[PDB]
Design a protein around this ligand. Structure first.
Ligand code: MGT
Length: 425
């Protein structure tokens, strides 16, 4: 068991899951990236089949491949393992303190859980829309507070629902609505003042180990939030991993065999580590990961590598070449006002090249072929340059001759892109 492999697998899995959510078919995209990614020179799919690491993004990728994962679920970034009791679901409408209706499954029954996070751990005891007890420990008061918030929302208590202020319209990267329980999570994670204010306070017995925490997140030996105790000693976070068969849908929601959602992209951490082992993504969907600059380098690199393939497709079947998925990373950098505008001008420049027969440039085709990917509109033509938006600044590529973005030295026969090299012919 290597820590560097585990750490790097998690980073690779998160990046792929985040990118996959924006796709039209997130599951198929995620599998494509998993099969075209290597970590420490080993294929990611081989690592996933051999690695026991349980983490949300990793387990989403494992699920995609039909592998077993932990039976536990993720909620608010905490791993929830049910240690006792059970519940049944009753679908209900509840009114927030903004009078927004939320359709939720109220869980009926008594249950006990451990909650395991990176900076905090807790035992949660709970009944129908009621938090009975929360024993929590963590690195600092802010980390304890994160766990408190999640448990309050998970409880589904009335006073939590009524503590909502303003409207809940949180969305993911694909502009899809978060589900109601995640609407509540994101809301109170942003600001828990009203939640903690309305929750209630109680006096506590001065027990050895246990202390209180107040609405302002400061500790107290005298009183605490209702049901909440802070363990000075860290709460026991160990258990044996029980792996089970799971299913997964188009949008990367992973379910156990009872149909309960264990994981989704909403449960994947936003934190970005620096990998200890080299991760190499070969998919074009991942060219964005190193910024807008590497997307240009990679786009032109890919054209030069597969030029004998592109040169055959360019003459015969041009519509198949324009509708490649490899030019979509380039098209995102092109300003939205001029995507169909340049797609006409450049597609007509290739039409004159085929019709006149003796105007085949090669350097002009590779330089401009990414602009022809969008749906074409009519063109005024005679453009001095074509703008491509990098980090804030809109650096432009000239039609004839070189530029800062595209610098082809004719003597060297090597293409440079924003300083860095990008293949050769
Ligand atoms: C409030 N919850 C939420 N929950 C589980 O947490 C996971 C994520 O909940 P969610 O984001 O509301 O998804 P959803 O599909 O709506 O969950 P549900 O199963 O409640 O319909 C699900 O597996 C859900 O069953 C719970 N599981 C148990 N055992 N007891 C509970 O009180 C609750």
């Amino acid at each position: 068991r290597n820590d560097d492999v585990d750490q790097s697998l998690i980073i690779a899995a998160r990046n792929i899951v985040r990118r996959a959510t924006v796709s039209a078919d997130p599951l198929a995209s995620l599998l494509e990236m998993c099969h075209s990614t290597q970590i420490g020179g080993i294929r990611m799919v081989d690592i996933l089949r051999q690695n026991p690491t349980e983490e949300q993004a990793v387990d989403i990728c494992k699920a995609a491949m039909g592998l077993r994962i932990s039976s536990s679920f993720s909620f608010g970034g905490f791993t929830f393992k049910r240690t006792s009791g059970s519940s049944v679901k009753k679908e209900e409408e509840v009114l927030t303190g903004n009078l927004q209706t939320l359709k939720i499954r109220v869980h009926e029954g008594y249950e006990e859980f451990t909650m395991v996070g990176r900076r905090a751990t807790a035992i949660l005891r709970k009944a129908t829309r009621r938090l009975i007890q929360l024993i929590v420990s963590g690195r600092d008061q802010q980390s304890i507070a994160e766990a408190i918030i999640v448990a309050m929302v998970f409880s589904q208590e009335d006073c939590m629902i009524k503590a909502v202020r303003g409207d809940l319209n949180f969305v993911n990267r694909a502009n899809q609505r978060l589900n109601p329980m995640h609407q509540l999570l994101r809301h109170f994670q942003k600001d828990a003042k009203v939640l903690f204010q309305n929750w209630g306070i109680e006096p506590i017995d001065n027990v050895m180990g246990m202390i209180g925490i107040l609405p302002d997140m400061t500790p107290s030996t005298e009183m605490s939030l209702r049901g909440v105790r802070v363990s000075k000693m860290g709460v026991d976070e160990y258990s044996s991993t029980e792996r089970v068969v799971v299913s997964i849908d188009r949008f990367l929601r992973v379910r156990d065999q009872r149909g309960n959602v264990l994981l989704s992209p909403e449960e994947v951490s936003e934190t970005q580590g620096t990998e200890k082992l080299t991760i190499t993504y070969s998919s074009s969907m991942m060219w964005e990961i190193n910024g807008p600059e590497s997307v240009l380098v990679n786009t032109y690199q890919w054209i030069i590598r597969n030029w004998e393939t592109v040169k055959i497709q360019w003459s015969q079947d041009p519509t198949m070449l324009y509708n490649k998925m490899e030019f979509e990373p380039f098209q995102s950098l092109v300003p939205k006002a001029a995507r169909g505008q340049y797609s006409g001008f450049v597609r007509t420049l290739f039409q004159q090249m085929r019709d006149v027969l003796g105007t085949f440039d090669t350097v002009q085709i590779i330089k401009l072929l990414p602009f022809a990917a969008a749906p074409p509109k009519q063109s005024r033509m005679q453009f001095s340059s074509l703008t491509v938006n990098v980090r804030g600044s809109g650096m432009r590529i000239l039609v004839r001759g070189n530029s800062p973005v595209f610098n082809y030295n004719k003597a060297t026969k090597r293409l440079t892109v924003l300083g860095k090299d990008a293949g050769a012919l």
